[PDB]
Design an enzyme around this catalytic site. Structure first.
Site, mmCIF file in Angstrom:
data_model
loop_
_atom_site.group_PDB
_atom_site.id
_atom_site.type_symbol
_atom_site.label_atom_id
_atom_site.label_comp_id
_atom_site.label_asym_id
_atom_site.label_seq_id
_atom_site.Cartn_x
_atom_site.Cartn_y
_atom_site.Cartn_z
ATOM 1 N N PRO A 163 -5.200 -0.910 1.817
ATOM 2 C CA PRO A 163 -5.147 -0.071 0.603
ATOM 3 C C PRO A 163 -3.902 0.805 0.546
ATOM 4 O O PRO A 163 -3.239 0.884 -0.498
ATOM 5 C CB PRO A 163 -6.458 0.734 0.689
ATOM 6 N N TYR A 164 -3.555 1.454 1.656
ATOM 7 C CA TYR A 164 -2.379 2.316 1.685
ATOM 8 C C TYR A 164 -1.110 1.534 1.376
ATOM 9 O O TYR A 164 -0.283 1.954 0.554
ATOM 10 C CB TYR A 164 -2.292 2.966 3.059
ATOM 11 N N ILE A 165 -0.941 0.387 2.033
ATOM 12 C CA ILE A 165 0.258 -0.411 1.824
ATOM 13 C C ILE A 165 0.315 -0.911 0.390
ATOM 14 O O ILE A 165 1.377 -0.906 -0.238
ATOM 15 C CB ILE A 165 0.302 -1.567 2.838
ATOM 16 N N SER A 208 -0.889 0.563 -2.237
ATOM 17 C CA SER A 208 -0.520 1.698 -3.084
ATOM 18 C C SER A 208 0.981 1.984 -3.006
ATOM 19 O O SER A 208 1.650 2.174 -4.034
ATOM 20 C CB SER A 208 -1.353 2.935 -2.707
#
Lengths: 240, 239, 244, 240
Positions: C152-154, C156
């Site tokens: 999810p972080y990557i 985003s």
């Protein structure tokens, strides 16, 4: 019947490429540099499996031998539909003054050689033909002692992209395949099982990729499914 | 062997479904709204000698996707290949007024991808394949393509991470990134001058077809794609 | 016309990298708007540190993912000196969640805070920064490693980079650069307080420089991009990770 | 007392880099290949503006001249903190057999040269030093006739990344700056008013980039704000 020239087809990935292209119906010119025994073994394996092939000696870094190679290759069937450049060396040398000889050698064999092959391919491949160079996935990792090798292969990829643009209007695709560590006979010959296991664990699929698995991507690029793939470097490394 | 294809009603998704059927897969043609085109795809597959069935599901709805995967795997007890082609491509510049559009694309393209990949990660067997469709336009960053590029760059990020998370499961995760393709829709909304202009962009100097995209997808889904993993393959004729 | 001091808005400036960015920009002569989301205390500490060192700054609350609070943020920030020369978007979250159905809430949260948030800031920056201004987003170097649970972080942050490149093209004719800085792991107070020394050493060895990068070392690259030496740097994602 | 060696500092980007590093407090070795006059003009401008510099001749692709360059450069202050490799050539030649001389030339000057400079830099720069190579943004576009040049510079980038890894434990950063077209005197002297106007509209900033705008990024990399930038290729091209 279309004709394919494969440089460095005596062993390993080049041999697997030659055998797969022959199985796909190409007449295969098995180009080799020095001792013909392995190249003739490649040719004989191709013929036994139902294909057609013949071997031609040429050092890919020698301009005169490359001029001859392309003339002689064209003499067989009068056509050169696919050119696959797999020949190269991978010596280890750190970026230090004492490594200057090794550097020159790699640049000479891998990059200048590539230029020669690509240049001649650009002159001889017909409209609708295909040009494929072999690069390496290690460019992404930049490991110590791989400097000269990576420099040579990065140069090859640069040439690939430019040539894809220079052949505008000829409908000729130019691509590269960049394998990771591959389970050739030479790869296994120099390694203990522990070394093999460590390399296997580098990929998420947790095994050693085979020369035939590289050749399959080369075959895609050389065939109908590769018609719209152009100026690409496809890394085939199991996810490593 | 069974393949699920999202967005298989028309265009690239349809070409993918039909080629995979021709390669011997049982194909679940997933569609979003009106069945008609999806059933046309199913019937073309059956007509050419294959097996297929159509299922409705919004790729961005968790409940509909959960149902999609339960049902798809229930047909033959297996889901060997999952291809996520469904998405939208609206134009909107990066301004506060575009916030609705942004939210929409992120919802359909990125959240949708997250859902499909997630469920694929749960259901694909050892040796299976997961393939997402991204886009080559990421390389050009054209004005008004911001939201679309953001969604698809996120998709590619998910592809690489998933490839790593499926370590030990022997499952490849890849993406195919087409350029502009000569869909029926592509042609209905463009004049001949527009088509000619787009054709000249690639060094091959023609318009790419959906089948030329499906061929790369089929490579990745088949024996020649076994050692290709965590790659985004751009299929754009060199543009 | 405007003889007020050049102004920089920095989101997520309460602590860590955002704080270092705000303090460095103040040292470079910017009036700094320290934007924060929830508890004022750390944001006010940043402001007071800036003022103790001889700079000017003030703090403004806004959740970057809330369109209404962002509309207010830009109205209020531009009102201080009538200008918003530089906008640096550092606010974000980095929760861990594998790509599984159960992670869907976390995913929604990260996309909401990191990507939609970025969109809002970038969009409003695109409307308010003058000709010659600078827009800088914070991405992440972990995109290159695709570690498990960073999905999810990557996703985003990769979306943020896509927005950066497009916006650089959309501001053609305005002479506004749009860039991103992508740090590796950084030695914030949170980093050290939540890590064992063995973990710290393991992370330190990942870079060839064999240490933990500091927040000021990230802020220095941001300051380059915001100042005269960054005039010709545009549409770039600069990875600042010590070689990892 | 801190010292920076700049290759190709006779004109253009190299000159701007040398002058900026001198302005930042470095003692600057202005290295040049043939044109002493312009190198002394650089050295002079530096001294005129309050800095300290001296010029040294060396062909970067000649191992003996490079060994001497580094011996003499280090001898001035007993230290060589920063090395910036800006020297290179950019001839145009399509990927065809007739272009092999041009290719050989570029590879020799740009890549082997880079290898030499970096190699010696890795041997002579102290812990905490900085090694910066100049690449090119045109790698992203792969324009026809740029094949050899792009191959050479892509190889340079490969060497930069590998060296960053090989110097682990020495606390030495290795980076590259990749400029786009820059408003050199050389750039302007062969161009029409409309040609310049067309090039000026390529970047979204819609102007011509200056050598000083490249030098500012090099200076960041050489100074305190670049401590944590390592193994990076920074493209400085106005967004084109």
């Amino acid at each position: 019947r279309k004709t394919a020239l494969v440089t460095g087809a005596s062993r390993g990935i080049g041999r697997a490429i030659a055998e797969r292209l022959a199985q796909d119906g190409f007449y295969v010119i098995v180009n080799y540099a020095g001792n013909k025994a392995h190249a003739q073994a490649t040719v004989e394996h191709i013929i036994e499996q139902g294909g057609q092939a013949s071997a031609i000696q040429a050092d890919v870094a020698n301009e005169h031998e490359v001029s001859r190679l392309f003339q002689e290759a064209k003499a067989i069937n009068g056509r050169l539909d696919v050119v696959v450049h797999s020949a190269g060396i991978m010596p280890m040398a750190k970026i230090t003054p004492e490594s200057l000889p090794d550097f020159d050698k790699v640049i000479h064999t891998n990059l200048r050689g590539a230029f020669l092959i690509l240049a001649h391919a650009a002159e001889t491949v017909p409209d609708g033909g295909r040009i494929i160079a072999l690069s390496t996935s290690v460019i992404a990792k930049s490991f110590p002692a791989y400097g000269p090798y990576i420099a040579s292969k990065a140069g090859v990829e640069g040439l690939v992209h430019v040539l894809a643009n220079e052949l505008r209007g000829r409908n000729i695709t130019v691509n590269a395949v960049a394998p990771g560590p591959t389970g050739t006979d030479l790869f296994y010959n120099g390694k203990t099982d522990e070394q093999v296991a460590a390399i296997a664990k580098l990929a998420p699929l947790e095994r050693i990729g085979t020369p035939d698995e590289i050749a399959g991507v080369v075959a895609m690029l050389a065939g109908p499914d590769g018609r719209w793939v152009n100026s690409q470097v496809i890394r085939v490394n199991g996810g490593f």
